[PDB]
CSV table of C-alpha atoms in Angstrom, one decimal:
chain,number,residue,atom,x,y,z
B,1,UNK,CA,24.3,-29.2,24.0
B,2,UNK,CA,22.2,-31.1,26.3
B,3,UNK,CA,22.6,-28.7,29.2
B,4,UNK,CA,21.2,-25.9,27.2
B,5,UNK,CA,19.0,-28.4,25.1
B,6,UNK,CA,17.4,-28.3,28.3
B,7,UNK,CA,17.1,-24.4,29.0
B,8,UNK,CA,15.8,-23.7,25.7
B,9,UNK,CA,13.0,-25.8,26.5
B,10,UNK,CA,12.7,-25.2,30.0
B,11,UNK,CA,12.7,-21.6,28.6
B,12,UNK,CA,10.2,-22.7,25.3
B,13,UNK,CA,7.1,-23.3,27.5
B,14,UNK,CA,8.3,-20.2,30.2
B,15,UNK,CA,7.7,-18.0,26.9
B,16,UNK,CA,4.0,-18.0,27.9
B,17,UNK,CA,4.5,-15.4,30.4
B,18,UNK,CA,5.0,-12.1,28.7
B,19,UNK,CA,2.2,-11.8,26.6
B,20,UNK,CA,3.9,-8.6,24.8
B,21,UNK,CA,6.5,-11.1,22.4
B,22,UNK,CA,3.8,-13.7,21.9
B,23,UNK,CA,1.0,-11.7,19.9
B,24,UNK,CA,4.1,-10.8,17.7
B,25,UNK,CA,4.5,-14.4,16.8
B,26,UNK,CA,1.2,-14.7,15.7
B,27,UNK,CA,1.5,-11.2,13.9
B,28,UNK,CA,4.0,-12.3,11.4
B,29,UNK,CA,3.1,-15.9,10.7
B,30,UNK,CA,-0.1,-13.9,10.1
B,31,UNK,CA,1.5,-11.8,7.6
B,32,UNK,CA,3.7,-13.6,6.1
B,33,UNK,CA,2.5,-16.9,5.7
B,34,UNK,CA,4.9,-18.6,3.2
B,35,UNK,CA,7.8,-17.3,3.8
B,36,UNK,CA,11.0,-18.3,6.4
B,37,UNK,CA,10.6,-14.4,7.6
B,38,UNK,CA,7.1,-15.6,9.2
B,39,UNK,CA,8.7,-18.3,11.8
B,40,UNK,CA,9.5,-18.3,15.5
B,41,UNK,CA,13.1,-17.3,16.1
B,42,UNK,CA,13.8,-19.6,18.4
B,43,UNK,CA,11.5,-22.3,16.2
B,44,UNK,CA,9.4,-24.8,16.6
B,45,UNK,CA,10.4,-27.2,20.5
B,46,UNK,CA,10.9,-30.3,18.9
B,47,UNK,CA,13.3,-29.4,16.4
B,48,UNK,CA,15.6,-28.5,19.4
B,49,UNK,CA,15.7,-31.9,20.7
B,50,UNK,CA,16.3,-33.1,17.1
B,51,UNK,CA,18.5,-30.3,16.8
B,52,UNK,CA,22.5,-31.8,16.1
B,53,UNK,CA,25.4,-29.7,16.0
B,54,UNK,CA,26.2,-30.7,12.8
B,55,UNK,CA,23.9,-29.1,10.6
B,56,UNK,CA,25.4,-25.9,13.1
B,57,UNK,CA,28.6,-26.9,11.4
B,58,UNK,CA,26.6,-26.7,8.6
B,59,UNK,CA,24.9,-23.2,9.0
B,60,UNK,CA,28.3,-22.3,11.0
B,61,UNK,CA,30.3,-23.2,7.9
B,62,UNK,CA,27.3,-21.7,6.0
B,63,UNK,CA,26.6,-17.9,6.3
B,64,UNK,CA,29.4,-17.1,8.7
B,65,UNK,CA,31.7,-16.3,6.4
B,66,UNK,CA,32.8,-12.7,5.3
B,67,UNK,CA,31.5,-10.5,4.0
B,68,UNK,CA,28.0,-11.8,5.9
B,69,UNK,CA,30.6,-10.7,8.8
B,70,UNK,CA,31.1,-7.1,9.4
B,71,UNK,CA,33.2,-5.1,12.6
B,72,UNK,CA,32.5,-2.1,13.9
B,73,UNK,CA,33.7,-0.4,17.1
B,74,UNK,CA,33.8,3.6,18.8
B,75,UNK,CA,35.6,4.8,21.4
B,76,UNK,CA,38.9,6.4,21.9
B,77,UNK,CA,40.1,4.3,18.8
B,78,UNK,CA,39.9,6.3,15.6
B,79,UNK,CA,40.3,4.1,12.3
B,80,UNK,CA,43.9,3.1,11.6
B,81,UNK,CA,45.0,1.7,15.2
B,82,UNK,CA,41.5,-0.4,14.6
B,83,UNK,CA,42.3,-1.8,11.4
B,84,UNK,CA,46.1,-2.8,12.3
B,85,UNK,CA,45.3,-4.6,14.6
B,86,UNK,CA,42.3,-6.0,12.7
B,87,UNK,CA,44.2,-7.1,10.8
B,88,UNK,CA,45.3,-11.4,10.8
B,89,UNK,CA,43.2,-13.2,11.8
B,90,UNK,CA,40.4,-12.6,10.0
B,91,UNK,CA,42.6,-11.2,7.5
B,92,UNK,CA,41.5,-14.3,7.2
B,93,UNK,CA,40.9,-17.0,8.8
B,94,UNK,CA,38.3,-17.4,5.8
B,95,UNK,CA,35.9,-15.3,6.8
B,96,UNK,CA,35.8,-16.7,3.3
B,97,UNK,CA,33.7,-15.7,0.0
B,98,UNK,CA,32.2,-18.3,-2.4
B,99,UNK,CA,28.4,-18.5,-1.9
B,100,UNK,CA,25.8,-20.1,-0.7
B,101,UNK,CA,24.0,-19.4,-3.4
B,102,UNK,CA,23.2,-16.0,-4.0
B,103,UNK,CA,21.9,-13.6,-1.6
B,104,UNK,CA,19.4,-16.5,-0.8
B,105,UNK,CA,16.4,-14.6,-0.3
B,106,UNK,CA,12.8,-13.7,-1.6
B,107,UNK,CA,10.4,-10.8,-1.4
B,108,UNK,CA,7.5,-12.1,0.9
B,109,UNK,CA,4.0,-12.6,0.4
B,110,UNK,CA,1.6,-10.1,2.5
B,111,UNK,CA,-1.8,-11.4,3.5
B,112,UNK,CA,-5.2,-10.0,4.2
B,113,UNK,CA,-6.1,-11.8,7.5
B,114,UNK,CA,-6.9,-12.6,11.0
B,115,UNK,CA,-5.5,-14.0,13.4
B,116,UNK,CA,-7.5,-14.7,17.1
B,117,UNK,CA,-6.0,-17.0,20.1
B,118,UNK,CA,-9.4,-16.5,22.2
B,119,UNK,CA,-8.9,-17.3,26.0
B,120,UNK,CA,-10.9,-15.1,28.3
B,121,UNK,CA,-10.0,-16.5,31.8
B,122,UNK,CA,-6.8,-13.6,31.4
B,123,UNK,CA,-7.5,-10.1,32.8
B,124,UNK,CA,-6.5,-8.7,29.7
B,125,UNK,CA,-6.3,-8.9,25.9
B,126,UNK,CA,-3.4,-7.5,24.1
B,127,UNK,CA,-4.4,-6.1,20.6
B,128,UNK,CA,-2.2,-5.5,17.4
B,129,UNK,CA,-3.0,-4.2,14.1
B,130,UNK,CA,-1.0,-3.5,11.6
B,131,UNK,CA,-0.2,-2.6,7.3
B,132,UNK,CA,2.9,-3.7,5.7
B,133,UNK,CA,5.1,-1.1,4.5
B,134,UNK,CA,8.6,0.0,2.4
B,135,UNK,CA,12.0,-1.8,3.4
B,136,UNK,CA,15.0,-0.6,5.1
B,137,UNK,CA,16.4,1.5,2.2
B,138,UNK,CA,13.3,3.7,0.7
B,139,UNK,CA,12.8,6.9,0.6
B,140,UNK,CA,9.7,6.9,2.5
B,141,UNK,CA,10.5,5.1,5.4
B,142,UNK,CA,11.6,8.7,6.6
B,143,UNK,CA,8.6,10.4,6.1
B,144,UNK,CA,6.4,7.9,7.6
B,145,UNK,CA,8.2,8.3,10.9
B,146,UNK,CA,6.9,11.5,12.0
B,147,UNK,CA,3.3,10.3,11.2
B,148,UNK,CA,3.6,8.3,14.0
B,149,UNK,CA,5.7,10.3,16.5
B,150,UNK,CA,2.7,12.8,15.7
B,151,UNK,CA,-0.3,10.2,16.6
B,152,UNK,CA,2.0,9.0,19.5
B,153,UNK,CA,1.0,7.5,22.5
B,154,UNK,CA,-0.3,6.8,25.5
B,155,UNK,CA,0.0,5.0,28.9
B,156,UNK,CA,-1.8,4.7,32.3
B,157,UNK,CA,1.2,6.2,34.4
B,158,UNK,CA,1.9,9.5,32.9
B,159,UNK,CA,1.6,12.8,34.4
B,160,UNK,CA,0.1,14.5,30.9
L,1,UNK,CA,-26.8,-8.7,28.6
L,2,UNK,CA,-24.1,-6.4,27.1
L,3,UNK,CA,-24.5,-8.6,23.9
L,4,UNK,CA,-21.1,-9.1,22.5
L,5,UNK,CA,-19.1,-8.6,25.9
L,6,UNK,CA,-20.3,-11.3,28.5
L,7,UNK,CA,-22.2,-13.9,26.8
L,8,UNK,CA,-19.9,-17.2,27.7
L,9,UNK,CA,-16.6,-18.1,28.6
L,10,UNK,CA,-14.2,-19.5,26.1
L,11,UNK,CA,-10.6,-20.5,26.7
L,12,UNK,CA,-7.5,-21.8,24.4
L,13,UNK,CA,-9.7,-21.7,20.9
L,14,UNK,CA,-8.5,-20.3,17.9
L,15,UNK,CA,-9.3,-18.7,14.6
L,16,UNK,CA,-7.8,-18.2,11.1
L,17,UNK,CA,-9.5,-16.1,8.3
L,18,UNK,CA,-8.2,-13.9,5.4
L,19,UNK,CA,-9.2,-10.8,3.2
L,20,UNK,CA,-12.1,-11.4,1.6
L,21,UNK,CA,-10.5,-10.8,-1.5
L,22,UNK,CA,-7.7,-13.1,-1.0
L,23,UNK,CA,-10.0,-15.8,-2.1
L,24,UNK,CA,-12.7,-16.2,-4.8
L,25,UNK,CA,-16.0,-16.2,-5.2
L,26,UNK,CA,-16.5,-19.6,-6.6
L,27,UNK,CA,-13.9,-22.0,-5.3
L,28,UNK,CA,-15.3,-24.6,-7.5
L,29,UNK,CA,-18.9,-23.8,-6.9
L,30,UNK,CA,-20.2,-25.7,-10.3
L,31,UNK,CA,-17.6,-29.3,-9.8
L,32,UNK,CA,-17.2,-29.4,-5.9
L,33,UNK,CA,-20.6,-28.0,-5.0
L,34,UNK,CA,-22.8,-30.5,-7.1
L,35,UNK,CA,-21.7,-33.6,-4.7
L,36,UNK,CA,-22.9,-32.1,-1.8
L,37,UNK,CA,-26.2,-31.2,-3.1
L,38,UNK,CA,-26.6,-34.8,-4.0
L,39,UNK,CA,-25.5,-36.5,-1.1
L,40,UNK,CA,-27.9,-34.6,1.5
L,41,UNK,CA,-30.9,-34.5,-0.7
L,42,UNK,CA,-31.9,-38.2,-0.5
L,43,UNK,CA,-31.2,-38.3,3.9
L,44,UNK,CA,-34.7,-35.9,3.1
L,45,UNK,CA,-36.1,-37.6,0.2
L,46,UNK,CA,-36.7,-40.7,2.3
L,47,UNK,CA,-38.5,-38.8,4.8
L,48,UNK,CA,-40.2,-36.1,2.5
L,49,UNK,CA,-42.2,-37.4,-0.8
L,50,UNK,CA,-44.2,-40.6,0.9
L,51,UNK,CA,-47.3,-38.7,1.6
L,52,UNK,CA,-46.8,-36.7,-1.6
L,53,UNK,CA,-47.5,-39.8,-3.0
L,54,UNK,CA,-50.8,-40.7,-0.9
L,55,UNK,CA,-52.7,-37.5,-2.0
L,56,UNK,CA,-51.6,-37.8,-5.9
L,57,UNK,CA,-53.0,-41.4,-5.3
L,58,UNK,CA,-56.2,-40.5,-3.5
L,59,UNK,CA,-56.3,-36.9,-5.5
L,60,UNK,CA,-57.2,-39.3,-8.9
L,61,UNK,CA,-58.5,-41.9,-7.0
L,62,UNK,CA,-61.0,-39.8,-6.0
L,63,UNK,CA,-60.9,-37.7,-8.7
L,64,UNK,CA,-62.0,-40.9,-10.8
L,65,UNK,CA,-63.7,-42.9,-8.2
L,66,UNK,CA,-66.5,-39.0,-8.4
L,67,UNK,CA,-66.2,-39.1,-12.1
L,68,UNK,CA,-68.0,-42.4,-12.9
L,69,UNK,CA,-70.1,-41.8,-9.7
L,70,UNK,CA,-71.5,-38.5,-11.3
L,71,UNK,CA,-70.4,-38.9,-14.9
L,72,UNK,CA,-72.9,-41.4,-15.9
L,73,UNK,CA,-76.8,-41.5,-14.6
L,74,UNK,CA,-77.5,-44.3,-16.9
L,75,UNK,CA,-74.6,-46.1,-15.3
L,76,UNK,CA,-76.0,-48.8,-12.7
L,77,UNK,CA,-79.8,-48.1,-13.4
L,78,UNK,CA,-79.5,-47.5,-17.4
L,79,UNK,CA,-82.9,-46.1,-19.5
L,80,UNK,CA,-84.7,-49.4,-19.3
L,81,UNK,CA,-86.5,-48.5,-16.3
């Protein structure tokens, strides 16, 4: 724990350094203000220190239980000879289902904003702009992702 | 020169704003509004209305001060003599 307590932060304040990830930060929280989707994946620093493995235990006990869980594989295996030797252990070793409430989640609030982290000393200022749009299952999300492939892109290295 | 581009240098500020119509027109305009207009209007008030005053005064006292003076001939010498 204390070992990678450490790294994390060591690694918190490296985080700096690709510029790329960080705007993205700022995007959501932008967005989504209100809502546990807007927050830093690795979180806030001090919370790490803070951070005691039991309220893991908690959030291990918590959402890793089937069917949360889910197994996949390809290969030469087909299906059968998978699921056979799937099968105890995690049969299961519960890998449970009760709860935890029910699915908890909410839809999230979108908000007309800006968001500017102004330091000019850098060579270079990343822009990102964006609208919020349909979720995963929609019918649209298919149709929109030509639109883009059409506008596409662009970059300083390419031959075109 | 290039007016928006090189004016100063600015470092580690930053800036939150939303949609303009996120918000409202009047966030209290009428209740939270009326303080303020209070509270700055005397730091002037002190400095503003004292010659205000001195004119007013001197605009009557004057103003009276020529009335008599004209108003009456028979005043100081009356129509005896």
């Amino acid at each position: 724990i204390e070992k990678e307590r450490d790294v994390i932060l060591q690694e918190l304040q490296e985080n700096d350094t690709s510029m790329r990830d960080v705007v993205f930060n700022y995007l959501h929280a932008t967005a989504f203000q209100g809502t546990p989707l807007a927050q830093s994946v690795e979180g806030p620093s001090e919370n790490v220190r803070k951070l005691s493995r039991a309220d893991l235990t908690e959030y291990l006990s918590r959402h890793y239980k089937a069917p949360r869980m889910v197994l996949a594989a390809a290969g030469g295996l087909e299906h059968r000879q998978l699921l056979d030797l799937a099968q105890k252990h995690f049969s299961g070793l519960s890998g449970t289902y009760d709860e935890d409430a029910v699915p908890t989640l909410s839809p999230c609030r979108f908000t007309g904003s800006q968001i500017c982290h102004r330091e000019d000393g850098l060579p270079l200022a990343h822009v990102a702009i964006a609208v919020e749009g349909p979720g995963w299952a929609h019918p649209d999300n298919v149709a929109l992702q030509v639109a883009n492939a059409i506008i596409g892109h662009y970059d300083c290295t390419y031959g075109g | 020169g290039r007016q928006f581009g090189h004016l100063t240098r600015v470092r580690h500020v930053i800036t939150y704003s939303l949609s303009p119509f996120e918000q409202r027109a009047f966030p209290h305009y009428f209740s939270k509004g009326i303080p303020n207009v209070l509270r700055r209007t005397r730091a002037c008030i002190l400095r503003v209305a004292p010659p205000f005053v001195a004119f007013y005064l001197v605009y009557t006292w004057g103003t009276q001060e020529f009335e008599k003076s004209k108003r009456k001939n028979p005043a100081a010498y009356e129509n005896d003599r």
